[PDB]
Subunit: 349 residues, 4 copies
Amino acid sequence: ADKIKVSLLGSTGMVGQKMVKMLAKHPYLELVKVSASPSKIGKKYKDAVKWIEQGDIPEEVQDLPIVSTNYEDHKDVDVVLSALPNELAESIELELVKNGKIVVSNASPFRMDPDVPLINPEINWEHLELLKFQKERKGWKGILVKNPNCTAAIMSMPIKPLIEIATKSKIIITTLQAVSGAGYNGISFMAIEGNIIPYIKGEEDKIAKELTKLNGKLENNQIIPANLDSTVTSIRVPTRVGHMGVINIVTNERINIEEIKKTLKNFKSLPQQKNLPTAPKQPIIVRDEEDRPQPIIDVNAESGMAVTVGRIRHENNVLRLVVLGDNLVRGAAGITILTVEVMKELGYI
Amino acid sequence: ADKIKVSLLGSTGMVGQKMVKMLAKHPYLELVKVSASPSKIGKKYKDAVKWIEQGDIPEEVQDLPIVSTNYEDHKDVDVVLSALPNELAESIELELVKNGKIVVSNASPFRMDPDVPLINPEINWEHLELLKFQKERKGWKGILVKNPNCTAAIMSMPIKPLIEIATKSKIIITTLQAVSGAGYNGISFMAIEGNIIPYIKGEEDKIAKELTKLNGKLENNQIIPANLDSTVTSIRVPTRVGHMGVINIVTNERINIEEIKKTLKNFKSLPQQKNLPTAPKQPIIVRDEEDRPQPIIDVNAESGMAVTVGRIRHENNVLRLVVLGDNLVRGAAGITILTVEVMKELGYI
Amino acid sequence: DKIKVSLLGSTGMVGQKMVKMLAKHPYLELVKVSASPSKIGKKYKDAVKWIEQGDIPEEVQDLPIVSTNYEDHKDVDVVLSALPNELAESIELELVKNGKIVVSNASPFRMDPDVPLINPEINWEHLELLKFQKERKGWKGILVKNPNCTAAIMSMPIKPLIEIATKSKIIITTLQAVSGAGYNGISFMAIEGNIIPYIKGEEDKIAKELTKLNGKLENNQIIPANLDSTVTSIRVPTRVGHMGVINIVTNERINIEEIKKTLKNFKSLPQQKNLPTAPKQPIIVRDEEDRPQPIIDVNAESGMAVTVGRIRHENNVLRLVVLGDNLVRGAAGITILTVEVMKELGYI
Amino acid sequence: ADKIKVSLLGSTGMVGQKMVKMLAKHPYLELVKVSASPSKIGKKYKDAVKWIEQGDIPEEVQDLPIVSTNYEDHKDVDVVLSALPNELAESIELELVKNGKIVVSNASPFRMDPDVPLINPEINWEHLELLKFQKERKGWKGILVKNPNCTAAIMSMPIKPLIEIATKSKIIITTLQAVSGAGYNGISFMAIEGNIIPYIKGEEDKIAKELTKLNGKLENNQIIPANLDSTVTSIRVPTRVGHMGVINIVTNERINIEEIKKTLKNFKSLPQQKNLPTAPKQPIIVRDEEDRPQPIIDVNAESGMAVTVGRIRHENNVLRLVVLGDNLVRGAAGITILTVEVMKELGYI
């Protein structure tokens, strides 16, 4: 196939290593440049990274030289992918886009910018149309696309196909997030093992707001935010990978429990239709067993691109369900790569 | 300092060992007999228990011989306390009550029986008055008093002083329950470490139903169930001790956070007033830091009898707060003993 | 040339491991699976609490559970056993007394003089004992044994160093994963954030079994290796992977680099004949001072290779840390490798 | 009680919070000043520390203002206690000592200095005599005493009473150390949970060498190192508090197994003889059960000041025993305080 040359910002972290691994064997996406901190620039990827993924560093990437995050080092790249930390992404990504680079990033800055698409492939690929007016609106020579917070990404999967119910209700959400969500070394053993921390800075606000844009509707070259009144409580649990979410759609709207299970299990979108390399066959898996989903059993579903839903139940004035997803793949690495695949498929390239 | 002689059924399990450790040093409750499995009867406590509590076995209980769960072995005790497993409690307990014994137990059978008080001291001590007509209603010679499910007991604490708002709203509760909740060896290491099991057999139904009785109002010898419409999701987490609850009261009622915090921090009842030995000075502790409560920090609050609440917040049509309590003490051992103390105080002796 | 086999104790962790491995084997065809009495007659998928990775191989999910009695294993070429130590003796003896070829990783008969205790790369030659077993035991069938999972792991590095390990005292400390006691053997409360410096009978099995594993086959029988070792076994909050600290007391000069070289270049029959379950390099050596580590190395070569690191020699003591997959190298894998070796040498 | 005013360097780390906790309630040791990093100086302890100990900050220390580590801020203390990290200790301590202060540190610098006593109270309080000549030998106006590596402190407990045998043999030791040994946030959850790291930078060398000095003999005002041929391997395990150790004494010497057990459990020294406040009545506890010692069961033995020994066995050419101690108390906080107690008792003040 005709290869599309890509570079990767923040390739040293957990999300970065996941992407490096997924790209090392990609059909047409050819990773030719990886970036990391300044002091590592010039060294080979294998000499700068502390491999945390499964197995050895791919040979196709181990010798890739570390380049800076500056425009000059990415001139020959077709698309720049970014996994930079939230506190460094704004300046870096802004300068690149100003210089004409096409940037697809999963870092938080700009995610809620009205002219920037926040993409989760299956959920709102149509929102990419915003790209048609971005250059003129921001006065950029480049292109910027964003991916949502990992938890938001996971939570949006079951909500979208049920957007009509969720829109007319009070959404209560409790999220149980794995330690890896804070990076590989973000949380100490002493602080979390055999424990629970009912607080994750800024996570609750990002979830509620981003969910509003992910489920929004495109009208007249703009995104009309979906009306979602959600209250969320994000908790950190002693889990390595996998974000769980207990969703309670408090509403008196009629609800056909079986039709809902059917709708979720049959949910397919453009990524599934065009059979994109990183698109899972069934983005949403429904489990009938009452003790599912569970991180150690379902986290890897379809390479971590599929979310698993269980305990779907309808009680008085409320539809409840439990969803699980790989925060590293579905929540970051995989959706960024899947976003690029979609863009190529739609001609934004 | 007159000693009231008591016996303990199911003294070998975690709840049992806790009560043994608590009774060993009680000011007036004298543990004189303990029961365990049949093959253990006749052996001294120390030779039949796999002690998992802190430090050595109390020297005032170690040599206590194990007796049977039959009437003849308890004719000489003032009160029969029981921490028997749910599946064996009904038949055993009923006979002791049918033969005239006063039985106070934390096992599930009879909890929702209209003529049996389901007590959590600070919450509904007044319900003990149901006993005035129990004998004639049941045709028993004895008296039976019950303590609720450990989780319900913990959840009911903050809900009581906020019963006015809880009655006029949809209550959504998600609970994170420690492994100890399933006994010392109920859950294997492989099944839970680094994992989450979004289900606990029968737990959710119990929580919802019992909260109704615990917050009910004793009116003319009958308990009027509190109108508490709640949907609960119980989850097992890799925690040793301490059940956490995320409570969302979705209503249109006015929500004053500073007022609610005052109400919760100043909550007190008969146990506190009378300074009963197992009563915490402050039954509800409120935390202002955003990362509280946490099991490893707060589960021991006031010897495990006080619950800890934090993250009290007000969002559109919803009051949210996080509560944590020691499931072995506040949730079982401590409330059974405290119940006996109240009974002594009110004259039921 | 297909070889039809059955599996006793196919429902436990080792059993499920073997099921996954056999489901896709070149010539070994799993035709029957056995489990406890109450499970007999049920389809495997309905009797087992699948705990392995992926789904249950479709060639096994619908296999109906059969008993452990001879009559149900008549049409089988070789009977593989992953039975628990407490039930194996009676069950296996009867099968063998009926003319069945039985290869098991259970402990009973491991130290029986006429029964080979095999760990492929270490002592495949010991399989010769089989040429005399029938008359020596008065059996119609055949019986082969695989060692204790920890012994199996500790033996890998000791073999190529047998000359020095022989003339010296050996001190061994082992840290064994929770799975070594099955999936539900140890509770969360008992081990999380903890260490239990004791595993019933483990230390005696390792010392004695290492003796036979490293023995010399002389004049139709095994000469136990003179391995004077004191071992202390400890249980740790790990899922899979048994670790070992091995100290051999030398009274000479040792070249660490040649030790590393000797270990990584270790090869044997299983490698020579490229058998399906034999790892290309049974012993992997790590130069980084913080290896091996269970989460990083436990899966080395599908779990058939052990990893050694921290190879040091000072104060007349050769010290090394080794790690092995207690479920594959420790059992499932070597039991299958053993059968492969048997087919390779003509015992079939 | 005759008061002794002290200050504590590194009051903020785990070991420091432990000491703060132990000194608040001390009979005659008055913690009058606490120190920490420069950016914390001038703030109240409660506002500068990330409290991680059980319960609340002692109110006798919560309002103490953080001072510097320089001499000017300690001119008024009788003794300066130090729990500073190994990498900063040397310069800071040397300067205090050079200015005439008496410093007792559990940090590694100067531990193996021949003119400086390395103390573990029971094992070698006698070595304190080195102080009578320390000024003449170092030129210092002050006084410096050191405490050993925590693992070495624990390991030296059982080796001392058995020094005659240990000296005529080859000692093989494998230590399994708790995560807290590397500080509260030294190791990440991802790196250690469900894992084992067979390496701890420089631990093995420290144990072997320090073991040599701890067990030495005082002769002609100096220390004759004990001839201890040790070969230690140190491993990191996923436990919170408590270092375990497998000690193998390879010797052909005749050994009476019951005499060893008798010798260990009966070990007592000056700290015990003088009934010092932080001295445990029984420095070494021996267990008969085959599955002991265990971190979660024994680490707290006598407020963490007593080590627990178990599995004592003599197979043939090897004396094997397993030992466990609290790395934070016996291994650091408790011995530093105990050391000061010994000094006061012997007239060093």
